[PDB]
Design brief:
Name: Macrocypin 1a
CATH architecture: Trefoil
Keywords: Macrocypin, beta trefoil, HYDROLASE-HYDROLASE INHIBITOR complex
Shape: globular
PDB class: hydrolase/hydrolase inhibitor
Strand content: 35-45%
Assembly: monomeric
Entry title: Macrocypin, a beta-trefoil cysteine protease inhibitor
Largest sheet: 8 strands, antiparallel
Distance between the termini: 18 Å
């Protein structure tokens, strides 16, 4: 499946062209740091929008971790969420914080029912009749990655992202 690597993760609104030229694309970002929700920002010389995504075999089949890039000597945080609640933020937690809170850091990264290459859903909790999908909302005047519950029925737009690796 999905290859381990160093990626950018671009939020895609319905109808948005992944390769679009109009500015404004918002990428998931670690700029707010550990212990708070993951936010988003556009391209810039001081952006923090690269993530190391790797398979985590111990978490199960097809599961991955999504870990921030750092240049210091601290343990990097990872996308983390409640394994029971929906409509909650995705937090950037290191493993000791994730263990303390009981949060899960395991994600599925599944290609959209035929959408373009690079277009994926980032899947959280799956329940009968409703699955949580990572998406972007505005909270307190700022972008925030969070878990949106959406039933998998015809015509509804399931949240997705354009995930591009380091090399073309």
């Amino acid at each position: 499946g999905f290859e381990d690597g160093f990626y950018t993760i671009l939020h895609l609104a319905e109808g948005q062209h992944p390769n679009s030229k109009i500015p404004g694309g918002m990428y998931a970002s670690s700029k707010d740091g550990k212990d708070v929700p993951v936010t988003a920002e556009p391209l810039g010389p001081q952006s923090k929008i690269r993530w190391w995504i790797a398979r985590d075999p111990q978490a199960g089949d097809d599961m991955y971790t999504i870990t921030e890039f750092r240049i210091d000597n601290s343990i990097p945080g990872q996308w983390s969420r409640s394994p029971v609640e929906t409509e909650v933020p995705v937090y950037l937690y290191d493993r000791i914080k994730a263990e303390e809170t009981g949060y899960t850091c395991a994600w599925r990264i599944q290609p959209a029912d035929h959408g373009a290459d690079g277009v994926y859903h980032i899947v959280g909790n799956v329940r009968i009749g409703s699955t949580d999908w990572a998406d972007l909302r505005e909270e307190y005047g700022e972008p925030q990655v969070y878990m949106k519950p959406v039933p998998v029925i015809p015509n509804v737009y399931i949240p997705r992202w354009f995930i591009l690796g380091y090399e073309e």
